[PDB]
C-alpha cells in the first residue's frame, strides 16, 4: 500500500520536470532563434 499523497507529489514533480525540460528546449533546441 503506497499512500496516495506520495503518489501524487511524486507524479506531480515528475510532470514539472518533463514540462520544465520543454521550457528549457525553447532556449536551446530547434525552437530557439540562434
Amino acid at each position: 500500500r503506497i499512500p496516495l499523497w506520495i503518489v501524487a507529489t511524486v507524479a506531480g514533480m515528475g510532470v514539472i520536470v518533463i514540462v520544465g525540460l520543454f521550457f528549457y528546449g525553447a532556449y536551446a533546441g530547434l525552437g530557439s532563434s540562434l
Binding site: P3, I6, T9, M13
Partner: peptide, 28 residues
C-alpha cells in the same frame, strides 16, 4: 554546470519534513 543537484535535494526536502511526520505520526 549542473546545479540540478541542488534543487533536487531542496525539492524533496519539503515533502520530507512532513513524510517523517507521517512516520512519527503526529501534529499534521
Amino acid at each position: 554546470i549542473a546545479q540540478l543537484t541542488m534543487i533536487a535535494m531542496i525539492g524533496i526536502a519539503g515533502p520530507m519534513i512532513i513524510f517523517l511526520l507521517a512516520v512519527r505520526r503526529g501534529n499534521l
